[PDB]
Design a protein around this ligand. Structure first.
Ligand SMILES: *C(=O)c1cnc2ccccc2n1
Ligand SMILES: *C(=O)c1cnc2ccccc2n1
Ligand SMILES: *C(=O)c1cnc2ccccc2n1
Ligand SMILES: *C(=O)c1cnc2ccccc2n1
Ligand SMILES: [Mn+2]
Ligand SMILES: [Mn+2]
Ligand SMILES: [Mn+2]
Lengths: 8, 8
DNA sequence: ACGGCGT
DNA sequence: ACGCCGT
């Protein structure tokens, strides 16, 4: 759920 | 995650 | 269920 | 010269 590199 | 030049 | 960078 | 995540 976090998007810091993927944003799932 | 660090932004020293890119800031991802 | 997910992965990324440039000055 | 630089490292981080939650629904
Ligand atoms: C988002 O909150 C989140 C939390 N845990 C994960 C585990 C694996 C893939 C993606 C995830 N996203
Ligand atoms: C994004 O691509 C990504 C990859 N690895 C991580 C590890 C810990 C927190 C955030 C991250 N983001
Ligand atoms: C941020 O903490 C971070 C860590 N590792 C990376 C590797 C590749 C591109 C971006 C990154 N960001
Ligand atoms: C920013 O553009 C950038 C490029 N290369 C690096 C290498 C090591 C630490 C920080 C960096 N920042
Ligand atoms: Mn990964
Ligand atoms: Mn580079
Ligand atoms: Mn977590």
């Amino acid at each position: 759920x976090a998007x810091v590199x993927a944003x799932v």
